[PDB]
Design an enzyme around this catalytic site. Sequence first.
Site, short mmCIF file in Angstrom:
data_model
loop_
_atom_site.label_atom_id
_atom_site.label_comp_id
_atom_site.label_asym_id
_atom_site.label_seq_id
_atom_site.Cartn_x
_atom_site.Cartn_y
_atom_site.Cartn_z
N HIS A 80 0.79 -1.67 -0.05
CA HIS A 80 0.21 0.47 0.38
C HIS A 80 0.78 1.70 0.32
CE1 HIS A 80 -0.07 -0.78 4.30
NE2 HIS A 80 0.06 0.86 4.61
N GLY A 136 3.32 5.72 10.14
CA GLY A 136 4.80 6.28 9.25
C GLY A 136 5.32 4.41 9.66
N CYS A 187 4.06 1.59 9.44
CA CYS A 187 3.86 0.60 8.27
C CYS A 187 5.20 -0.23 7.86
CB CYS A 187 2.75 0.90 7.45
SG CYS A 187 1.35 0.59 7.76
#
EC number: 3.4.19.12
Lengths: 306, 306
Positions: free
Chosen positions: B41, B143, B145
Site C-alpha cells: 500500500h 508511518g 508500516c
Amino acid sequence: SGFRKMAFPSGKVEGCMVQVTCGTTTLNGLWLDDVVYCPRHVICTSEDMLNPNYEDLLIRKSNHNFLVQAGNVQLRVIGHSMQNCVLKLKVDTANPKTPKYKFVRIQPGQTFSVLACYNGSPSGVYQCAMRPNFTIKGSFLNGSCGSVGFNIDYDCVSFCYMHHMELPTGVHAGTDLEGNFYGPFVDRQTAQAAGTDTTITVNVLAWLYAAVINGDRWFLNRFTTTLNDFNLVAMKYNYEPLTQDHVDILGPLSAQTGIAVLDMCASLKELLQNGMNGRTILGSALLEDEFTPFDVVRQCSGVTFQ
Amino acid sequence: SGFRKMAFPSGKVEGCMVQVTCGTTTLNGLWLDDVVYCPRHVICTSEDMLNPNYEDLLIRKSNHNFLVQAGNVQLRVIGHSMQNCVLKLKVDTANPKTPKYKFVRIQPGQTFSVLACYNGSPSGVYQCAMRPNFTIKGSFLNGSCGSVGFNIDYDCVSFCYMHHMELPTGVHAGTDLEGNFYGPFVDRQTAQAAGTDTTITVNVLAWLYAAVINGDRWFLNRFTTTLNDFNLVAMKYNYEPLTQDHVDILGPLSAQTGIAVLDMCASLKELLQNGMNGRTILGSALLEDEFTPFDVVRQCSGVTFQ
Ligand SMILES: *[C@](O)(C(N)=O)[C@H](C[C@@H]1CCNC1=O)NC(=O)[C@@H]1[C@@H]2[C@H](CN1C(=O)CNc1c(F)cc(F)cc1F)C2(C)C
Ligand SMILES: *[C@](O)(C(N)=O)[C@H](C[C@@H]1CCNC1=O)NC(=O)[C@@H]1[C@@H]2[C@H](CN1C(=O)CNc1c(F)cc(F)cc1F)C2(C)C
Ligand SMILES: [Ca+2]
Ligand SMILES: [Ca+2]
Ligand SMILES: [Cl-]
C-alpha cells in the site's frame, strides 16, 4: 495507537560490548575508543568479596592479567587504572564502532534501557527507572555485571548505568560510568538494604495522559484540586511530592489533551482513595510509574534516533 | 533474579531498515542482500485505500517511481514485483549489513520483538505475542508500516512479521515476509474486526514457573488435577485448551522447579476461580500470557545471541 514499555534500539551499544576475564572471573566491559570500562570486582575471587581491598588486589595485577575479547578477537591491554568502583583498561585498538556518546548521571525518576549481556554477548533489552531509593527493578543473573543502561538522543548514546550487584527483594544497584554508585550501596558482600521506595508521581500522571491520548478515559472526574491538597493525599499512599517543575514538565501533555495538570491530579487522588474497582488503564490493574513525560511524548509522537 | 518483558537486541535488524517513498506515501522497508521488502500500500494515495486494485495501481509505476533511502544514501531500484501483500524492490546494491536470516511464519502463542520505525529510522523495541485471534498488542502510529517483528537464534534473524494496519480497540495486524496476513485481515480500509481473543494457557503456566524460580510462591496449593478437569475450568475463563504438546514443552521448567505441570495446573485453576485477592505475581495484578516457556528458560538461563 497502543502503549508498550519500549526500550531504545540497542545496535549502537551492542557494538561496544566485550568480555573481561581476570583469573576465574568473567563479566562484561564497555569498549569506547581505546578504553574498556568494567566493574572493579572482576579482580576478586569468591572469598575476596566479603570485604575486598581493591586498591591492594589491583597492585598484584599486570596489564597482561586482563583478557579482553571483542567477539572472537582478543584486545591487548596496554594500561589500567581504577576510578571509584570502575576499572579503565587502555587497549591498543580504538573501537571502530564507538558511537557518539556521553557519560550522564541520571536523576531518580528518570528511565533508561538496559542491554543485558553475558560473556560480552547481548541477551535482551528492556526499559527501567532509577527508583527514588536508587535501585532498579532489573532482570540480572550471575555474569551480567558490566551490562550498561543508556538513553539515545538522535545520534548520541548517554551511558548512565553499569550493573554491579543484586539486593534483597530481587532489585539491582550499580554505578554511573565514573564508577560512583547510585544510592548508598558499596561493592562488598555485606548486609545492605534498599531504602523504602516511593511511587514516581510525575510518571503516573504522564501515564494517565498516555491513557487519555489512547482513548482510555473512564477515570477522568469532573473535579480539580490545589497542588497542596494533592500532595497531602499523595503522601498517605507513599507517592513523591509533585513539584512545580513536575507540573511544568507535564505542560505539553496537558495542552495536547486539554486536561490541566491539577485536573488530572484530582483524578489520580480519586484512584488512590477509591482504587480501580477491577478496571484497567492501558491494560494494567496497577498504576504505572516507569514512563516519564518525555517517554510518553516520544512513544505517542514517533520520535526516532540515528 | 528479576523478571522483565525483554526484547531481542535490535542491532542486526537496525542495519536493514530503509525508507520507501512512492508519490505522497513514505513508510519503512527491510533491505536484505539486494531486495527491499515493504507493504504494497506504499503505492496508494489517501482515497485509494477504501478498496485499491494493487495489481492495477502497480502497473502505472516504474522502478524510478520508488525512492529508497538507507539513511542519507539513495538506493537505485532496478526491479519490482508484488508477492501477496508485499512489494519486492530489487536494488543495485546488496546490503553490506545483511545478517544471516530466515523468513518464518510463527504460530499463535509465540512471541517476537518489534523494532518500531518511522522514515526508515528505529524508534524503539518491545516484545509482543501473536494472539490466538492473529492480532498483536503493539504501539504503532501512522508511518510505522513496514516495521518488522523478529526472533534471534544465536546469529540468525528469523523475520516473522511486517506491520500493515491497526484494528478497532488499538490492536494490530500484518503479514509474514511472504506478504500473507496473519488471521483473516485484508489491506483495505473496510469494516474488519478481530475475532474474540483467548488467554494463551501454556504461557501463563510458563510465567507461574518464572514466579517460583524468582521466589514468588504464595499461589502454590497442595492439590493436583487431571488435564481434562483443568481444561473444563480453563474453558469458562476464555483460556485456550492445554494440549499434551504444551505439557511436554513445560517439562524442563517442571523439572527445574520440581513442580509437575498438572500440580501447577491445580494452582492456576484456584487463581482463576478465586482471583488474586489484591496480591501480585512478579509485580503483576493480572495473569501474564505473553511469555513462552522458551522466553522463561532464556531469561532465567541468560542465553545470548551473536
Ligand atoms: C556480578 O558480579 C556478575 N558477575 O554478574 C554480580 C551480579 C549479581 C548476581 C545475581 N544477580 C546479580 O545482579 N554481582 C555480585 O555478585 C555482587 C558482587 C558481590 C556480591 N554481589 C551481590 O550481588 C550480592 N547479592 C546479594 C543479594 F542480592 C541479597 C542478599 F541478601 C545478599 C547478597 F549478597 C559484590 C557486591 C562485589
Ligand atoms: C501504515 O500504512 C503506515 N503508513 O504507518 C498504517 C499504520 C496504522 C496507522 C495507525 N496505526 C497503524 O498501525 N496502516 C494503515 O493506515 C492501514 C492501511 C489502510 C487502512 N489502515 C488502517 O490501519 C486502518 N485502521 C482502522 C482502525 F484501526 C480502526 C477502524 F475502525 C477502522 C480503521 F480503518 C490499509 C489497511 C491499506
Ligand atoms: Ca600474551
Ligand atoms: Ca533519478
Ligand atoms: Cl498489572
